[PDB]
Design a protein around this ligand. Structure first.
Ligand code: HEM
Ligand SMILES: [O]
Ligand SMILES: [O]
Ligand SMILES: [O]
Ligand SMILES: [O]
Lengths: 498, 498, 498, 498
């Protein structure tokens, strides 16, 4: 390269001389303080780690493309979803509870975080492999996630703490049922479905509004593992899912999902018999059928896992024109929480990293800070200005809002006609599951209750009978026999647990 | 508590009102920006994680006591090792390569980081479950650890990268042999030995010097698992070792280790036939026998894992009077590197956290910074001063140094009479291992080479024949038969690996 | 101290040996990497600085006591304001625009940040030396502060940018008038008044509500400097105010302020002819007279400026029972913004530093993070729990809220009968100022406009005529004569400005 | 721009809608939590500040070009200094003690930090406007800088602390003399000289070594201000120097400096009668005359002060082939300290910001970390490797080293024949200063001693008599008369100082 090159450089671009021996006073002497190559390489190594995501620490992903193949222009003006549009994507899959090195095949919810690099900005649909969640208000979220993680003294996960939380927060029943059924253990990420979970607002060119749910249906089908199979794989290959996805794309096999929405007319959101703003509820497909939008294909692996996946920063706040949030309190908390976490996790200029930059021109009133890579030159730092540096100043009602009225309060959402904590769970167990799925469910739930502190077990029996009397008695019988599956990722009991 | 109490507070000590519902405009309305309890709890949750240790992310520990029961005052003036002395301790055990959530029973070196809370400061003996290491100069360390972690694109561990490094750095043979033998898989932390590895300097009251090795011999014996057993446990219980230690102490069973040293007279350090400043070498016990010092007992579990173990910050630089470092280049790099990592990992006042504070009075010229909990009031910020605020000013040769002479260089340490890369490895395989250990070793090493890229396998066969011709041919035969154990924690081959 | 002591320690508590010479290979040789005392002291020094506050970087303060001497129990249940109560306080004074080293006597608003260490938590009244502000919605705040700071290319403050902002945001007129009058330059912090500015909610024991303004009237009177005097002092003594306060307390001279409130009945807040939720408005004392509460006395200097003042973290969100926020949008933004800034500026455990800790027992659902000094042991990390670890769960309307109704919008607050941008400014200039104050005001404002870009000057003449036709013509005449005072802290014109 | 554009974007590139009003529930209602544009802009604003440099917080600079016009190839192989070479530069000027907002015209040393963007990396000559410094060992540096900053309780600078340090560290006399003479107050940065201060190693193509000093002589001459003039300007224009430089370049007036070196033959470094490795010493130009190299011209202002100047990160460790460090202990400490400070101040990827990137290809073994903008793709993370990813492995003595021999010690450098603390100071006062400069010096030093605590004043009189008996008696006489200049930036005495 240069006349004095040595095969590598220091950080300033000068030849490094050696990547293999330190600078010493003679062969036998001490290292000197001015071994700058030693200092720079150690100091960098010491700063390679960044805080893991909380939650969803363990994951990986791939790039691809979304292709619109239907006409949903009547429901939305969003450029990404206009007829024929092809958009570059990035999808990160994850578990929830486990940390950075934790086995992929623990029983858990999976994340399904999808970015669309649109002509009007980055559009993030940060979903999960379930249409619902455990909770309906974000004040409970911190407590739920901590219940799912480790005991403060011993540092062990503990099914007693999990069940103490779940039983004391019966809104959790719908999603815990789903978690304990077949789908708590996907065989691969390619073989699970993806959902937005929340209701979102779609707005058309004329300003008319619909409430929407998103459903990504795998073209590879839904395939799951048993508890015993997942536990075996956890030991043999802690990165089974990560490996599977990367190898599949490497071999040219491009996993696909079809996107469908449900669309509720604006005024019907207030009157529907289940609350669409309640994240523990599904919306009947009889009442609001799925409408096809198009197809997602993953076709390109990362070249750098840390820069393109670990550093990726997805947010529900990354909406685009034609798509808004909704009165779902959980979604409203998420609009604050992700960007906040990322400022700490990654840094103040997280959105200037390549994977997080939009394709379109950014013109944003934010300046300075640590690691300001793409500065604004002499552009105006204030508005209005007499300098030819533009700004935004639309007044009046926004196109992606709604109405509200009341006193400031902290209380449960009002029940719709058919809202409760246990009904939809009960449908799932009685009507959706097969006989064999029911059998397996009883083995799972009894297994998850083994060794749990008796007072909490008794509350869990009442909880499962409220879902369904027959399943609940079956679970209780099996737990009183000291039977049931080992659950990958967690256990109860013993002198280091509750 | 207070007249207006509600059961919990915000950060300012005021009643929090609700830990369970957010502040909304009516039951059905949006959350308001001024839900300060929601913001404070989310913002804290978002900042709970700190970067994991690199390396040694996965670990746990316990408090105890060291009791001196012999007289080694002739070799050292250190208060902690004077006859009869009892000192409070903290011991953190760990693996090396795996991240925060990784299974405890992966094949790996274990850490054995021991702090003594002495009357003359915190004395840290930051050791491992092996007397040696893979390398003899710290410029190689960053490269070794990265070889032990994940592929940059796919994020998978890869035995090809591990073996490419090891074969290209034959100084690694002694420790890789130890790693691939019985002791790469302890059954429990209670059932492994601990070692300082490095030579350290001991200095007596009269100033006379000895070079010392530390050996902690478990009173519970050395007990190991097979590859197959460890892989099974990795799936069933990723925190097997953590759990075992906590439960054992909880039950009143106090694990013990006896400390012995070897003591080389100062002048003999320069002449000994193996280089004691070379971390890939053991010192013959025939030449320098073990001398008993005393007994370590662990007897108290943490009450808070994160504050007392995760935040603990051990450093080889934490010497005390009577104990010094040595010309071992690896130890000299460690004296810089740990404190540096901790400033980033934990913060600038890491040593003001309770677990890291000394028992004795600190009088240190450092001030301000983020999170300055224990400030110095109006004390002098400079020296000398006319203010009655003391400082240190000893001139001349230090009591814990040595001599050096030469030109500034980057080169291998000079060989002693019997120094090489393969000899001591060869002794271990031929003379220390039993027949059955040899058999198992061949299954381990062949297993670890399965699927490794052929060019690297061929180099590995030469490497193992250099250790011992018979073991090397046995390994090569078994690898060419496509046989050998699955190794917990790693594999090779396939479209997502080298 | 210890047998081997040397006069100071390293961070681990061991003797440091020397604070005055580095560890070298002979007298003439290089410093060795393992000079750990050198590394620790440099690495700490390198991390002493933390980001300065934005805004209000330049300031200082003192501790004292608040004594209630009247009965305002009818308006509030807050313990701190109940008859007879004596409460420890801390008060930090500041400028706004200038950075850490900037002269105290620049023309500017002053901060008046008062903490009360109450029995029901820390109560922060974070005010200023003015009853109003420049703006009525916090989206404008970032832009205003940047207009008040430096040009992006040259790094100079610039009166053109200041006036471009002010003229394009005519809501600023009331406060700019106050800024350009006598009170923009206090002689000392002891000789200025303090105000809450915002309307706050007070709530009595029976739940009845009043809207309140706070007024701290100096017992030392209101004394100001001329522009020329302040500029002279800026050169001679950049820390004039800091010095004055510390010396005055050191000499035993305890500066005092009397607290008065105005109290508007709840329902009258909606109907009053000026909007009390509009921070650019004062409330007539004829309509709502001042009601005495008690007396503030400062009587104790800090022993450590950095730990007790620089690290202090005040927030309007630090309310206590009996005191709430209000529909003032500016206050509502501040409830989020201060705690957020402090997490970055100081750290995640900012509220565990001594100066920021409450006197009463904290029971808060937040755990872990960097620098966790006061950990929660084995306490429950979730709610509800079966572990005896309490939490809060009040449901329904809060005691310190109010009502709202409408669609989501971005628009100006609705005008009350007498709301406008220029009226109250006009009263101040015409009716409150003396003849001599008017004269000085014209010299100040003309001075501040000297060298400002002509197009912006013309807008400023219209702006000042809208305040008052006579003052505006006088200013314009003087600016067209190229006359007026030099303003401490800023200028316009030239090749490095707009 | 886009169909739905509004004049600005959020961080994701989507239209922001309004930079001027917040999202509220009706005109009169509260702001909602999901005003993401409000949150993003406030959260960014709150993170714009980064820690100021310690020391040298206050400064500015400009870009330019260096042109070699002589032949010094016989002394160095460095590409930047080969005949005819033209190289892009960046120069930052600064004071030392004052913080970010402090007046430019305080009495102080000035920094002269020059980067050359060479074909073999960034070459940083981080100098000052003086050929010497206050100290000769870096363990004293932290203490000196803190002595120059603020009292721990009151936060005031204090000449008593300054003089207590200086008198107790008489090595300081040479540089304090220079500081208190004419050159402590440059009129402009354009009108001062620049120096490397330290001895550096130059190495030619054949490996032959010389010790070198760098001297940048202003073509605008050396022009200074009186104390009274500088104090006046401090009040009137705190950014006088910053403004001057920017306006001068804006007007097309390109300030220039001629570079000269002194060159000492390698073996003569050990024998010279003054120690060239002692930073408190100058080298006689009679013994080693100046040799011209070329000319520095500044010709381009920054477009963004924060990105190009505030974030610039200069280090003496940024040497290039042909230029090395030296046995000067102060320089050896600086090789560690700057890069360390920058990791905290700016971040782990400070050297990836544009202003800090080299022009040539970087091939450096460092990966991951926060804000990794320019990732290494799938390149090898270790060495040696079988992957075609190069590394460095030169063995033996380095081309830019030297010899050493001795025991590890902490002691003063050995004196050369003519080394002492006061001699060179004495020459400066007696022989270099004019009569009128001597007069002014007496007024400066007496002024700086006014109000200083008597015990420290008495030590200062002995100190100045040791420099020169006549100057010392003159200073003492004037101080006992209570006379002398006000010093811009500092004073003594009173109840808030020592
Ligand atoms: C929406 C408008 C405002 C916002 C977003 C805002 C934001 C901030 C921020 C972020 C800080 C730095 C906090 C820290 O780092 O500790 C601060 C400081 C300060 N603010 Fe504001 N501010 C606003 C308006 C005001 C008003 C109207 C007042 C007076 C009523 C005020 C008084 C102060 C004071 C006195 C400080 C210094 C606190 C101290 O001494 O530590 N601010 N502000
Ligand atoms: O999540
Ligand atoms: O390590
Ligand atoms: O502020
Ligand atoms: O410096």
């Amino acid at each position: 390269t240069t006349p004095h090159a040595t095969g590598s450089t220091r950080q300033n671009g000068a030849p490094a001389v050696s990547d293999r021996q330190s600078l010493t006073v003679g062969s036998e002497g001490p290292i000197v303080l001015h071994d700058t190559h030693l200092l720079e390489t150690h100091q960098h190594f010491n700063r390679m780690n960044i805080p893991e995501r909380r939650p969803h620490a363990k994951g990986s992903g791939a790039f691809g493309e979304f292709e619109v193949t239907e006409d949903v222009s009547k429901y939305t003006k969003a450029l990404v979803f206009q007829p024929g549009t092809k958009t570059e994507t990035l999808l990160r899959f994850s578990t929830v509870a486990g940390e950075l090195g934790s086995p992929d095949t623990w029983r858990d919810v999976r994340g399904f975080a999808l970015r669309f690099y649109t002509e009007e900005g980055n559009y993030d649909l940060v979903g999960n492999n379930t249409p619902i969640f455990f909770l309906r208000d974000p004040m409970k979220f911190t407590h739920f996630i901590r219940s799912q993680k480790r005991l403060p003294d011993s540092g062990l996960r503990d099914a007693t703490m999990q069940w103490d939380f779940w039983t004391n927060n019966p809104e959790s029943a719908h999603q815990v049922t789903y978690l304990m059924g077949p789908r708590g253990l996907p065989r691969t990420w390619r073989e699970m479905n993806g959902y937005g979970s929340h209701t979102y607002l779609w707005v058309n060119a004329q300003g008319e509004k619909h409430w929407v749910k998103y459903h990504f249906i795998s073209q590879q089908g839904v395939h799951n593992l048993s508890n015993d199979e997942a536990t075996k794989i956890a030991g043999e290959n802690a990165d089974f899912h990560r490996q599977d996805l990367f190898e599949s794309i490497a071999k040219g096999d491009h996993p696909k999902w079809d996107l469908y929405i449900q669309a509720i007319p604006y005024e019907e959101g207030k009157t529907y018999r289940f609350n669409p703003f309640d994240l523990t509820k599904t919306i009947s497909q009889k009442d609001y059928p799925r409408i096809k939008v198009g197809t997602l294909t993953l076709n390109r692996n990362p070249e750098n896992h840390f820069a393109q996946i670990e550093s990726a920063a997805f947010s529900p706040s990354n909406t685009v024109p034609g798509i808004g949030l909704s009165p779902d309190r959980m979604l409203l908390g998420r609009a604050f929480a992700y960007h906040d976490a990322q400022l700490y996790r990654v840094g103040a200029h997280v959105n200037q990293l390549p994977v997080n930059r939009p394709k379109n021109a950014v013109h944003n009133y934010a300046f300075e800070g640590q690691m300001w890579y793409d500065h604004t030159g002499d552009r105006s730092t204030y508005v209005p200005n007499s300098n030819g540096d533009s700004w935004s100043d639309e007044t009046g009602p926004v196109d992606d809002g709604w109405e509200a009225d009341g006193t400031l309060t902290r209380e449960a959402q009002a029940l719709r006609a058919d809202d409760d904590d246990f009904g939809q769970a009960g449908t799932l167990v009685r009507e959706v599951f097969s006989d064999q799925e029911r059998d397996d469910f009883v083995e799972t739930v009894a297994g998850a209750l083994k060794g749990v502190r008796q007072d909490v077990q008794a509350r869990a029996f009442e909880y499962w009978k409220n879902v369904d009397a027959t399943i609940g008695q079956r679970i209780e019988d099996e737990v009183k026999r000291h039977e049931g599956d080992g659950i990958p990722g967690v256990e109860a009991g013993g002198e280091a647990r509750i």
